[PDB]
Amino acid sequence: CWSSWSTCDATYKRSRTRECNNPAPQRGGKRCEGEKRQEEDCTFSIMENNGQPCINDDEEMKEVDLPEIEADSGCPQPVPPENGFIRNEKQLYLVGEDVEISCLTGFETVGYQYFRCLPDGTWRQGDVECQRTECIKPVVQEVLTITPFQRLYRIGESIELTCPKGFVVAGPSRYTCQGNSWTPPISNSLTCEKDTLTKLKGHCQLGQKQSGSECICMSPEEDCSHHSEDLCVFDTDSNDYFTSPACKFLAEKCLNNQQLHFLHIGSCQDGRQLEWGLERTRLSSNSTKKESCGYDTCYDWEKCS
């Protein structure tokens, strides 16, 4: 048979245990085929529906319809002012009915704010606008750590954004919102790029990373098109005064030319005063090595310190 039916409990799916007891022993050989316990879901109702209930099967989207009957003479849902936000949203409004409009976060409704449905299908559209009381925090990126940090900012308040512990936002650092609401780009965002002052993993920037072994170098000109501040260097038997963007400085110094090395410094626009310091760069391996201070020009070009 079946037995053990129980009221709803701890978990609880009603146990309903089943015993093989009908036979009884036996030559053995044996048992019976089936599951011992189901263990089906328990139901509960609050309920008071009256009930009955009576239901039928039908579904809509937004069904096309259209629901609109213009023989009933009523207005469609109106379009709110700039920054929208109409309360009590309906599909069809009655004639003579007026619906209040409010502003999204954050503004303030200025003037007479209401829309009354005319006998004809149009709206009265009384004079109203939205003035900005407060400007809100931009979407930005998880990199910041932006100050001051609030939910919303009043007109006259400026916000400062910096990217720690390394890199930089490169600008704009600070902006104020008069609505307005500054000019932050949300398309290109910010995405702080590692600073030149950062010593840690600075040679892996040109690496790429994730391949192969992994980060080493990038070439020939693929690191260019960037801002690349100018620096004045001299090497490779040509030995002119030159000048060069920082893009090609870390390019010329790499697996390619580092066997013949390269040199050095900057940041001179080439130049007046710093020129004689390169004069004066003619002592390198002469007559043995370079021991002065940073006369070795570090190895990987550092700050240095």
């Binding site: 009655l94 004639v95 003579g96 007026d98 009354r116 449905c117 005319l118 006998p119």
Partner: protein, 49 residues
């Protein structure tokens, strides 16, 4: 199509007299409407213009 004022009155006679209605300081020109209901419990309606 906007409602203006409502008034409820007891009927002793069968001829229900209502207090005189009035046109607002800044009237809205056009054809007005007067609707009547029995309140409780009937749905009987009437319309005047």
């Amino acid at each position: 199509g906007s409602e203006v004022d409502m008034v409820e009155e007891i009927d002793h006679i069968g001829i229900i007299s209502f207090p005189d209605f009035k046109i607002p300081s800044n009237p809205r020109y056009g054809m007005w409407t007067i609707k009547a209901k029995y309140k409780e419990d009937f749905s009987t309606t009437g319309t005047a213009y």
